[PDB]
Scaffold this motif. Structure first.
Motif, PDB file in Angstrom:
ATOM      1  N   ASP A 261       0.807  -1.212   0.000  1.00 47.93           N
ATOM      2  CA  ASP A 261       0.000   0.000   0.000  1.00 47.93           C
ATOM      3  C   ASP A 261       0.845   1.270   0.000  1.00 47.93           C
ATOM      4  O   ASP A 261       0.356   2.327   0.415  1.00 47.93           O
ATOM      5  CB  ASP A 261      -0.954  -0.003   1.198  1.00 47.93           C
ATOM      6  N   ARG A 262       2.098   1.182  -0.453  1.00 47.44           N
ATOM      7  CA  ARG A 262       3.003   2.330  -0.554  1.00 47.44           C
ATOM      8  C   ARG A 262       3.219   3.015   0.794  1.00 47.44           C
ATOM      9  O   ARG A 262       3.470   4.220   0.854  1.00 47.44           O
ATOM     10  CB  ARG A 262       2.503   3.342  -1.593  1.00 47.44           C
ATOM     11  N   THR A 263       3.128   2.252   1.881  1.00 44.48           N
ATOM     12  CA  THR A 263       3.351   2.789   3.217  1.00 44.48           C
ATOM     13  C   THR A 263       3.659   1.634   4.158  1.00 44.48           C
ATOM     14  O   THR A 263       3.465   0.462   3.822  1.00 44.48           O
ATOM     15  CB  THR A 263       2.143   3.595   3.711  1.00 44.48           C
ATOM     16  N   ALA A 264       4.146   1.982   5.346  1.00 46.85           N
ATOM     17  CA  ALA A 264       4.486   0.988   6.355  1.00 46.85           C
ATOM     18  C   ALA A 264       4.426   1.637   7.728  1.00 46.85           C
ATOM     19  O   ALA A 264       4.663   2.839   7.871  1.00 46.85           O
ATOM     20  CB  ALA A 264       5.874   0.385   6.107  1.00 46.85           C
ATOM     21  N   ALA A 265       4.106   0.827   8.735  1.00 46.44           N
ATOM     22  CA  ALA A 265       4.007   1.292  10.109  1.00 46.44           C
ATOM     23  C   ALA A 265       4.570   0.227  11.039  1.00 46.44           C
ATOM     24  O   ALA A 265       4.826  -0.912  10.635  1.00 46.44           O
ATOM     25  CB  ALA A 265       2.560   1.633  10.486  1.00 46.44           C
ATOM     26  N   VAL A 266       4.763   0.609  12.299  1.00 44.56           N
ATOM     27  CA  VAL A 266       5.318  -0.269  13.322  1.00 44.56           C
ATOM     28  C   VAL A 266       4.293  -0.419  14.437  1.00 44.56           C
ATOM     29  O   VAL A 266       3.722   0.575  14.902  1.00 44.56           O
ATOM     30  CB  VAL A 266       6.650   0.272  13.873  1.00 44.56           C
ATOM     31  N   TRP A 267       4.065  -1.658  14.863  1.00 46.14           N
ATOM     32  CA  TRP A 267       3.144  -1.969  15.944  1.00 46.14           C
ATOM     33  C   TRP A 267       3.923  -2.299  17.210  1.00 46.14           C
ATOM     34  O   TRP A 267       5.057  -2.784  17.154  1.00 46.14           O
ATOM     35  CB  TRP A 267       2.232  -3.142  15.572  1.00 46.14           C
ATOM     36  N   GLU A 268       3.302  -2.035  18.358  1.00 50.92           N
ATOM     37  CA  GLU A 268       3.913  -2.296  19.653  1.00 50.92           C
ATOM     38  C   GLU A 268       2.918  -3.017  20.551  1.00 50.92           C
ATOM     39  O   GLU A 268       1.704  -2.945  20.350  1.00 50.92           O
ATOM     40  CB  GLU A 268       4.386  -0.999  20.325  1.00 50.92           C
ATOM     41  N   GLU A 269       3.450  -3.717  21.549  1.00 51.48           N
ATOM     42  CA  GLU A 269       2.648  -4.455  22.520  1.00 51.48           C
ATOM     43  C   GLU A 269       2.841  -3.808  23.885  1.00 51.48           C
ATOM     44  O   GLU A 269       3.913  -3.926  24.489  1.00 51.48           O
ATOM     45  CB  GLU A 269       3.047  -5.930  22.547  1.00 51.48           C
ATOM     46  N   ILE A 270       1.807  -3.123  24.370  1.00 52.31           N
ATOM     47  CA  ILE A 270       1.860  -2.392  25.629  1.00 52.31           C
ATOM     48  C   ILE A 270       1.032  -3.145  26.662  1.00 52.31           C
ATOM     49  O   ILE A 270      -0.132  -3.480  26.409  1.00 52.31           O
ATOM     50  CB  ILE A 270       1.359  -0.947  25.465  1.00 52.31           C
TER      51      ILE A 270
ATOM     52  N   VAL B 115      -0.777  -1.544  19.884  1.00 53.05           N
ATOM     53  CA  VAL B 115      -0.930  -0.112  19.662  1.00 53.05           C
ATOM     54  C   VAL B 115      -0.008   0.325  18.531  1.00 53.05           C
ATOM     55  O   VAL B 115       0.911  -0.393  18.129  1.00 53.05           O
ATOM     56  CB  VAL B 115      -0.633   0.714  20.934  1.00 53.05           C
ATOM     57  N   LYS B 116      -0.269   1.526  18.023  1.00 54.45           N
ATOM     58  CA  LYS B 116       0.520   2.141  16.958  1.00 54.45           C
ATOM     59  C   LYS B 116       1.211   3.367  17.548  1.00 54.45           C
ATOM     60  O   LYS B 116       0.661   4.470  17.548  1.00 54.45           O
ATOM     61  CB  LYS B 116      -0.362   2.513  15.767  1.00 54.45           C
ATOM     62  N   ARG B 117       2.428   3.167  18.058  1.00 49.17           N
ATOM     63  CA  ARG B 117       3.164   4.273  18.662  1.00 49.17           C
ATOM     64  C   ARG B 117       3.638   5.265  17.606  1.00 49.17           C
ATOM     65  O   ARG B 117       3.598   6.481  17.828  1.00 49.17           O
ATOM     66  CB  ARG B 117       4.348   3.738  19.467  1.00 49.17           C
ATOM     67  N   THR B 118       4.085   4.768  16.455  1.00 48.16           N
ATOM     68  CA  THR B 118       4.564   5.631  15.387  1.00 48.16           C
ATOM     69  C   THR B 118       4.389   4.920  14.053  1.00 48.16           C
ATOM     70  O   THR B 118       4.194   3.703  13.995  1.00 48.16           O
ATOM     71  CB  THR B 118       6.032   6.025  15.589  1.00 48.16           C
ATOM     72  N   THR B 119       4.462   5.701  12.979  1.00 48.43           N
ATOM     73  CA  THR B 119       4.333   5.196  11.619  1.00 48.43           C
ATOM     74  C   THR B 119       5.573   5.583  10.826  1.00 48.43           C
ATOM     75  O   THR B 119       5.964   6.755  10.813  1.00 48.43           O
ATOM     76  CB  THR B 119       3.074   5.748  10.940  1.00 48.43           C
ATOM     77  N   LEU B 120       6.189   4.596  10.174  1.00 52.09           N
ATOM     78  CA  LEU B 120       7.391   4.835   9.385  1.00 52.09           C
ATOM     79  C   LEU B 120       7.090   5.743   8.199  1.00 52.09           C
ATOM     80  O   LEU B 120       6.367   5.353   7.277  1.00 52.09           O
ATOM     81  CB  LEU B 120       7.987   3.510   8.904  1.00 52.09           C
ATOM     82  N   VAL B 121       7.642   6.955   8.216  1.00 53.93           N
ATOM     83  CA  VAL B 121       7.417   7.923   7.149  1.00 53.93           C
ATOM     84  C   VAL B 121       8.412   7.678   6.022  1.00 53.93           C
ATOM     85  O   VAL B 121       9.109   6.656   6.006  1.00 53.93           O
ATOM     86  CB  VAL B 121       7.524   9.367   7.675  1.00 53.93           C
ATOM     87  N   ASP B 122       8.480   8.616   5.075  1.00 55.24           N
ATOM     88  CA  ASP B 122       9.379   8.526   3.923  1.00 55.24           C
ATOM     89  C   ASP B 122       9.133   7.247   3.125  1.00 55.24           C
ATOM     90  O   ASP B 122      10.069   6.569   2.695  1.00 55.24           O
ATOM     91  CB  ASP B 122      10.846   8.628   4.354  1.00 55.24           C
ATOM     92  N   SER B 123       7.859   6.914   2.926  1.00 51.44           N
ATOM     93  CA  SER B 123       7.456   5.727   2.175  1.00 51.44           C
ATOM     94  C   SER B 123       6.409   6.143   1.153  1.00 51.44           C
ATOM     95  O   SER B 123       5.263   6.432   1.514  1.00 51.44           O
ATOM     96  CB  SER B 123       6.914   4.642   3.104  1.00 51.44           C
ATOM     97  N   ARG B 124       6.798   6.172  -0.120  1.00 50.19           N
ATOM     98  CA  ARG B 124       5.904   6.563  -1.201  1.00 50.19           C
ATOM     99  C   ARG B 124       5.754   5.508  -2.286  1.00 50.19           C
ATOM    100  O   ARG B 124       4.709   5.463  -2.938  1.00 50.19           O
ATOM    101  CB  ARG B 124       6.386   7.871  -1.849  1.00 50.19           C
ATOM    102  N   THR B 125       6.760   4.662  -2.496  1.00 53.26           N
ATOM    103  CA  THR B 125       6.720   3.617  -3.503  1.00 53.26           C
ATOM    104  C   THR B 125       6.657   2.247  -2.820  1.00 53.26           C
ATOM    105  O   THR B 125       6.239   2.138  -1.659  1.00 53.26           O
ATOM    106  CB  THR B 125       7.930   3.762  -4.432  1.00 53.26           C
TER     107      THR B 125
END
Lengths: 653, 333, 375, 183
Positions: free
Chosen positions: B80-89, B104-114
């Motif tokens: 989907d031209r994007t990526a994120a990181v999941w965490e277990e809290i 949970v979704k603490r942050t999302t990996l940016v700089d992802s377009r292709t």
């Protein structure tokens, strides 16, 4: 060990075929996890059901038997004993303890065989696997006894002959069953195989029972007493161990030749014409094996055929002659009945020596690192090296050590006896153990204690600190104190120490005061770990210091706190607030110069905080009250300092 | 003796990949159902469905895991031209084991377009870094200076290896004077392009990542590359799974000053060039110790090799996906 | 060793003492411990903070006086206290009400929680035969005693969960671990029963008549080297060492004389250090029980002289024979005994040797602490 | 009986004491009380039957008499012999030093009571050995010869003969003790 490996494995799956699936792999401690998926294949299929039945593929499936665990335990015990005893060569005592270890291993293997036979007759389905492993371990025991009587203790004519005699007596257990069947079926004093049983008893060297059997046969018959007496006289004339070995080999050979020629003369005189049983017995005793070739179905195997030929027409055996007669017996047995088995070839190789070649053949037939490593260590501890037993292909010793370590690391709890393997590795076993123990957790006690001990002995603290920081963060997750301090002391970290210090400061700010000042005062007050830790400890002790109230030490410690300059202004505000009642009295501890130097440092830090951000303005709305309090306190301090200066001038004037 | 069946998991659509924790027990899956499932294999012999929740809306592909010593995070790849990181809290403290835990979704990996290729982790040594790559030839390196803030991703390195990078492998240092190595295998979808393997080193004189050496031999689109685990040696072994079985050995010659300034004189020798698969290979994986090699293919065939004594790899395990596994050979220990 | 001459006068008896569940370490010990005393002021369990740590803590030198944090009265008598998880205190009572607290590990305060009652069952009258030994598998608790009853419970439980009463109603005495799920039990008749939390498999059919009697044993513990190796000491007068992994197998039998074998203890780091507190005798520390023989350790014992300030190890050179744990044949005596009594008639009742820090709670209204016992 | 067997004769001499006469007085009083109890008690022939309660389902354990239990304990393996040997050794080490101590009379009374108890137990066993062969489920009874010739962890033998010999050397007032030993 050739360039090519082995045939493909993976047992067939009961199903599939009609559907299009795939199997993906996942690594682990020697146990591959296979999962069914729908990746790239030849077709397409979906619709699958869920069921908890994971696919765990491993080559250590034999560890599930209760015998193998005990075997590994006693093998580790004997290995540790041998490694701790083989530190000073001598020769005679070395061979003595080697023979003792061999006898201990023999008794251990006998107990293992009896307990596995008990388990086999207790079970029903696994009988095929049980008898197969029994046969392969019996071949292993045969090879071990052969190598022990050959390479471990090279005995000449006499001792080695007695060794082989008792080996054949322990390996042959059919004459007793034959005698029992003779006693059971028909009359117990006459049968069709009684002569065969007598011949077997004579061949096995059991004269005590052969004489009784001959007496019984003579009492049953009516014209065999003279023949039995002649046989007894021949057996008496037959020399034993008191003629050779420890006496004279030439005299032993002369006595053997005399007995042989006397037997030939007694056979050719003509008294052996009647009684086809005793005639055949005497003919076999000479050297003719026509009866053996006719009844080879009862002559067991070519191993016993060869040992019988050796007992018959071989008073003195030569290695090259031994191998020649071995291959001759193998050929004469294959000419009568084929045998598509590699055991005869393995035994022929063991006879023709080449220990490395025999090890390679056994490895390419059925791999077994434990026995080959033990025999390699045994032949290396004898301080004897020849130009035909050197290991080839990388380091065989290191390869076997790594295999033995992985065989234990592939399971839980049983990987305890694997740390002692890397006590003689050239700075490689430590990394090999780290690569295995840096991925699995450690929730035990003695195991981790021994690991840390061997690590501090080998002088390597990388993974030590890596585990210590994990323990420290796990303790901080529950907000520990003493355990966290001990872990920080053992790790000598910095980031985690700053983190726990900030956490303690936040907890103190949230609670207003501190009450656990004695829980973290058990490992410190001397060893200066870091600046912030020393400041935290000095504040924790300043608590009790101003609790007991002492002007001189309180002033000194607050001066140290002000000179530290590594703390938020919120603590210094309360310090300057509560250090005024202690100074209200007319004292001379620290003059007005130093007092106002500390005051000017405090106000400079406050102005710096003002220019940077805000003095907790967004947190609380008491900034004006704090400023008014600071102003009135500094006014009172100036008044007290002026009065003190006036008194000092009046006293000095 | 293995309880093998014909059906597994619960994903109705095309299951892509799976992953397992380095400490075991915990697992995770990524399929085409736009919902990832995490399982917990207990000690009783059963692996029940622990959790199942949505993550991506464009066919999640890869999935990576990390050690609990540095933070239990999960970084997955998708189309989907994007990526994120999941965490277990988890909540509470430690009274009755662990309390309520949630994803949970603490942050999302940016700089992802292709198309995101691989965004796995990196060895520590000089710090735990995160390598973000795509299908353009730009590799970014992010670091987490704040241990209490998992959303901070400071960009301190951005290398442009050109072409179209596909696989990226790392090689840590063996001592205090060694630098980490990075191998990059590109996939420009054209076998006529000479040069697909790039080597990058951590130069101490420039404090960056310059091109150490190149290789013009492998011109086919590289599918996967895997370095051998460091055992305190100078030379290295590499497995390149593209269309056949390729294993090379890189030996050092001049790794000092003067004679080796910005580049290092390394000799690459083809120690294994086999092609018994009669097709192509997808991914290649090494054992945790460095003795077993695992790979599959597009025709539904899995081939597993083991080490011997002459640094050679021979097919020991041959499995058929559509058919039935034939043969039986278990050496044992 | 490191025994000095200073000795404080603290009138506080001690029956047993439990510590916080330390992980990945057995020598290091926390500074706060829950002491179930026989009678400080009365039968109760208190919390004491000092400075006990591994390899001798830096702060607080010789003779450290503990400090009381919180006192909670315990009904009955304390005989077994084991930590299940992290914040769980399970204490057994002689009246039959096993108490369980979910105390705070950081607040230093005990919280009254639950109680497992009904431990004496009899038809017709009433006989007080409760459970004595208590073991924890996390999160499982198993209680046994001289009654044959096996009380099994899990985490967070107030009533009875499993009451195993098989036909082989023996009289259990002591419990010991094997790994992570296997537990062995020594009974008060001379038999051993090893089971696994997965499936109960009792087998008390190991009678030894030649080379080692089967007198009812008492205490049992594990060796620092190899967790599977165990050591059992009882009324037989022989500290029997066993290399049990799934089956009963002995290894060393040291014929102890003038002793009772009430509570055995091991020392980590150096596993060749074993102590045995009893009621028949004074103070003595064994040094050659499980191991072979360590020189420079006599000239003392019982109550005469003292050997401290030095722990001489056997010389390590170029040997030709194996020398390790081997001491079978119950015909020896007291090989290498270290006298810990300062030549004074005292009556001790508890001695915990968790690491190099020894703590001795006696009935003579005094305390004894040794920071180092191996150097 | 359980209290007197657990607390007494186990922790009564090797405890926190600031005076040497305390242990002597405690031992003398305990021995006198035990001797008086064993002299007042008399085993009856009716104590050999199965004393099993069977009244309306009152199935209880074998409620053995306390005196019979004490006699059986003294007949089998008991620490009373070791305690008497230790007391005799202490008396010898006190007598061979020759010092004016007020515990000599207490020691003499204690050893006289011990000799009287031994004589009474022997005279009781002389008739108890005849009623045990006919009683169901007999106990483990050991003769006095084995208890006197048993091995002790001090000199591979019993120091009773040594104490008797030292009594003749220190014979200042042990005529009654020597007479009891001869008896």
């Amino acid at each position: 060990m050739e360039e090519l490996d082995v045939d493909p494995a993976e047992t067939p799956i009961p199903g599939l075929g009609q559907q299009n699936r795939h199997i993906g792999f996942s690594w682990g401690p020697g146990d591959l996890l296979l999962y069914e998926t729908l990746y790239q294949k030849q077709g397409n299929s979906e619709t699958a059901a869920r069921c908890p039945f994971m696919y765990l593929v491993r080559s250590d499936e034999d560890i599930y038997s209760p015998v193998l665990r005990k075997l590994f335990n006693e093998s580790h015990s004997i290995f540790v004993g041998l490694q701790k005893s083989a530190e000073e060569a001598s020769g005679k005592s070395r061979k003595a303890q080697l023979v003792q270890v061999s006898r201990n291993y023999r008794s251990v293997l006998r107990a293992c065989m009896e307990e596995m036979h008990t388990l086999s007759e207790s079970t029903r389905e696994t009988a095929q696997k049980y008898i197969s492993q029994i046969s392969i371990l019996s071949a292993m025991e045969l090879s071990w006894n052969l190598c022990e009587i050959l390479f471990i203790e090279s005995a000449p004519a006499g001792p080695l002959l007695i060794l082989l005699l008792e080996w054949v007596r322990l390996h042959v257990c059919e004459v007793d069953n034959i005698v029992q069947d003779v006693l059971r079926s028909e009359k117990p004093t006459e049968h069709e195989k009684f002569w065969d049983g007598v011949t077997g008893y004579v061949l096995q060297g059991r004269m005590n029972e052969a004489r009784q059997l001959l007496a019984k046969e003579a009492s049953t018959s009516a014209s065999a007493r003279s023949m039995c007496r002649v046989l007894d006289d021949l057996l008496k004339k037959m020399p034993m161990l008191h003629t050779g070995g420890t006496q004279t080999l030439t005299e032993f050979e002369l006595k053997w030749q005399h007995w042989r020629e006397e037997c030939e003369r007694h056979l050719q005189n003509g008294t052996f014409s009647s009684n086809v049983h005793m005639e055949a017995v005497c003919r076999v005793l000479l050297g003719d094996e026509e009866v053996l070739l006719e009844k080879r179905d009862l002559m067991t195997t070519w191993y016993h055929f060869l040992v019988s030929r050796l007992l018959f027409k071989h008073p003195t055996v030569k290695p090259t002659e031994l191998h020649f007669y071995a291959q001759s017996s193998l050929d004469m047995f294959l000419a009568g009945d084929s045998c598509p088995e590699p055991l005869d070839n393995i035994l022929l190789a063991a006879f023709e020596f080449d220990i490395h070649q025999v090890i390679k053949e056994f490895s390419i037939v059925s791999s077994n690192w434990w026995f080959v490593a033990h025999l390699t260590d045994l032949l290396d501890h004898c301080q004897l090296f020849q130009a035909h037993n050197l290991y080839f292909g990388a380091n065989m010793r290191e390869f076997l050590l790594l295999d033995y370590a992985s065989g234990l690391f592939s399971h839980h709890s049983l990987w305890q006896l694997g740390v002692d393997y890397f006590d003689y590795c050239p700075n490689l076993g430590r990394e090999y153990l780290k690569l295995h123990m840096e991925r699995i957790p450690l929730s035990t006690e003695k195991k981790a204690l021994k690991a840390l001990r061997i690590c501090e002995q080998r002088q390597m603290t990388e993974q030590v600190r890596s585990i210590c920081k994990t323990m420290a963060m796990q303790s901080l997750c529950n907000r520990r104190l003493g355990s966290a301090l001990s872990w920080s002391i053992r790790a000598k970290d910095a980031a985690f120490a700053t983190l726990i210090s900030d956490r303690f400061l936040k907890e103190y700010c949230e609670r207003g005061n501190f009450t656990d000042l004695d829980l973290i005062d058990n490992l410190g007050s001397a060893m200066l770990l870091s600046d912030r830790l020393t400041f935290l400890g000095k504040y924790r002790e300043f608590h009790r210091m101003y609790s007991q109230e002492q002007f001189s030490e309180a002033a000194s410690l607050l001066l140290s706190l002000m000179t530290a300059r590594i703390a938020p202004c919120s603590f210094w505000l309360t310090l300057l607030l509560d250090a005024l009642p202690l100074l209200e009295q007319k004292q001379v501890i620290f003059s007005a110069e130093q007092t106002y130097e500390l005051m000017r440092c405090l106000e400079d830090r406050m102005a710096a905080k003002l220019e940077s951000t805000s003095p907790d303005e967004i947190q609380k709305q008491d900034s004006s009250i704090d400023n008014t309090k600071v102003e009135m306190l500094r006014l009172a301090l100036a008044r007290n300092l002026a009065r003190a200066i006036v008194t000092e001038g009046a006293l000095q004037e | 003796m293995f309880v093998a069946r014909s059906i597994a998991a619960d994903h109705k659509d095309l299951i892509h990949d799976v992953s397992f924790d380095f400490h075991g027990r915990r697992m995770a899956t990524c399929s085409s159902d736009q919902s990832v499932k995490v399982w917990d294999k207990s000690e009783n012999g059963n692996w029940h469905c622990t959790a199942s929740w949505k993550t991506h809306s464009g066919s999640v592909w890869r999935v990576t895991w990390a050690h609990p010593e540095f933070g239990q995070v999960l970084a997955s790849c998708s189309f989907d031209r994007t990526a994120a990181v999941w965490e277990e809290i988890v909540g509470e403290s430690n009274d009755k084991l662990r309390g309520q835990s949630h994803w949970v979704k603490r942050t999302t990996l940016v700089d992802s377009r292709t198309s995101v290729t691989d965004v796995k982790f990196a060895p520590k040594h000089m710090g735990l870094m995160l390598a973000t790559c795509s299908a353009d030839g730009v590799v970014r390196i992010y670091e987490a200076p704040d241990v209490m803030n998992l959303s901070q991703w400071s960009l301190q390195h951005e290398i442009s290896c050109k072409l179209s990078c596909s696989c990226i492998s790392w090689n840590p240092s063996s001592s205090r004077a060694h630098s980490p190595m990075i191998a990059v295998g590109s996939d420009d979808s054209s076998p006529n392009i000479m040069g697909k393997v790039q080597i990058y080193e951590y130069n101490e004189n420039t404090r960056k990542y310059a091109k150490a050496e190149t290789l013009m031999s492998v011109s086919d689109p590289v599918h996967d590359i895997a370095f051998a685990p460091n055992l305190g040696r100078s030379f290295h072994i590499l497995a390149v799974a593209t269309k056949d079985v390729r294993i090379f050995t890189m030996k050092p010659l001049r790794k000092e000053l003067s004679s080796s300034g910005g580049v290092t004189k390394f000799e690459i020798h083809t120690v294994a060039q086999f092609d018994n698969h009669n097709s192509q290979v997808w991914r290649v994986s090494w054992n945790i110790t460095g003795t077993v090699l695992a790979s599959s293919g597009d025709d539904g065939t899995v081939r597993l090799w083991k080490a011997n004594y002459m640094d050679n790899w021979k097919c020991i395990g041959v499995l058929k996906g559509d058919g039935n596994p034939v043969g039986n050979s278990y050496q044992g220990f | 060793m490191a025994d000095k001459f200073a000795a404080k006068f603290v009138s506080h008896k001690i029956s047993r003492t439990r510590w916080r569940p330390v992980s990945a370490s057995s020598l290091q010990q926390p500074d706060v411990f829950a002491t179930g005393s026989w009678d400080n002021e009365e039968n109760k369990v208190c919390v004491w903070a000092t400075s006990d740590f591994g390899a001798t803590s830096l702060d607080e030198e010789y003779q450290g006086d503990p400090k009381q944090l919180c006192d909670i009265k315990h009904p009955g008598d304390v005989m077994d206290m084991q930590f299940l998880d992290k914040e769980r205190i399970v204490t057994g009572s002689s009246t039959g009400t096993v108490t369980i607290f979910r105390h705070h590990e950081n607040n230093q305060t005990l919280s009254v929680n639950q109680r497992w009652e009904q431990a004496h069952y009899h038809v017709g009258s009433n006989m007080r035969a409760p459970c004595t030994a208590i073991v924890c598998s996390s999160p499982e608790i198993v209680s046994v005693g001289e009654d044959g009853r096996i009380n099994c419970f899990r985490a967070e439980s107030r009533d009875v969960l499993r009451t195993i009463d098989d036909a082989d109603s023996s009289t259990m005495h002591g419990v010991t671990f094997l790994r992570t799920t296997e537990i062995l039990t020594v009974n008060s008749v001379g038999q051993l029963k090893l089971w696994d939390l997965r499936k109960q498999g009792n087998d008390p059919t190991q009678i030894f008549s030649v080379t080692g009697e089967r007198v009812p044993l008492h205490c049992v513990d594990r060796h620092p080297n190899q967790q599977h190796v165990v050591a059992t000491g009882g009324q037989d007068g022989m500290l029997c060492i066993w290399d049990v992994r799934h089956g009963k197998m002995p290894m060393s039998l040291l014929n102890a004389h003038e002793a009772e074998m009430w509570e055995v203890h091991f020392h980590p780091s150096n596993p060749d250090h074993l102590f045995t507190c009893s009621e028949d005798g004074s103070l003595w520390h064994w040094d050659a029980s499980a191991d072979s023989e360590k020189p420079t350790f006599l000239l003392g014992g019982r109550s005469t002289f003292n050997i401290s300030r030095s722990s001489i190890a056997p010389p390590n050179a170029n040997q030709s024979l194996a020398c390790a744990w081997l001491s079978t044949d119950p015909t020896k005596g007291q090989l290498e005994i270290t006298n810990l009594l300062p030549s004074s008639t005292l009556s001790v009742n508890s001695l915990d040797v968790l690491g190099q820090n020894l703590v001795c709670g006696t009935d003579a209204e005094a305390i004894y602490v040794t920071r180092r016992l191996f150097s | 009986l359980q209290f007197l067997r657990d607390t007494v004769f186990l922790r009564y001499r090797t405890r926190a004491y600031r005076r040497a006469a305390e242990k002597w007085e405690v031992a003398e009083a305990v021995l006198d009380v035990f001797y008086k109890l064993l002299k007042d008690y008399e085993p009856q022939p009716e104590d050999f039957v199965d004393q099993y309660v069977e009244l309306q389902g009152e199935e209880r354990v074998a409620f053995k008499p306390p005196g019979f239990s004490l006699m059986h304990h003294l007949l089998n393996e008991s620490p009373m012999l070791e305690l008497c040997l230790s007391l005799m050794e202490e008396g010898v080490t006190q007598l061979d030093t020759y010092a004016p101590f007020p515990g000599k009379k207490h020691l003499e009374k204690a050893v006289a009571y011990c000799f009287m108890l031994l004589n009474l137990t022997l005279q009781k066993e002389n008739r108890f050995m005849d009623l045990l062969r006919e009683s169901h489920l007999s106990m483990i009874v050991t003769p006095l010869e084995q208890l006197l010739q048993g091995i002790n962890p001090r000199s591979k033998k019993a120091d009773n003969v040594v104490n008797i010999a030292r009594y003749l050397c220190h014979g200042n007032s042990n005529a009654e003790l020597a007479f009891e030993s001869a008896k």
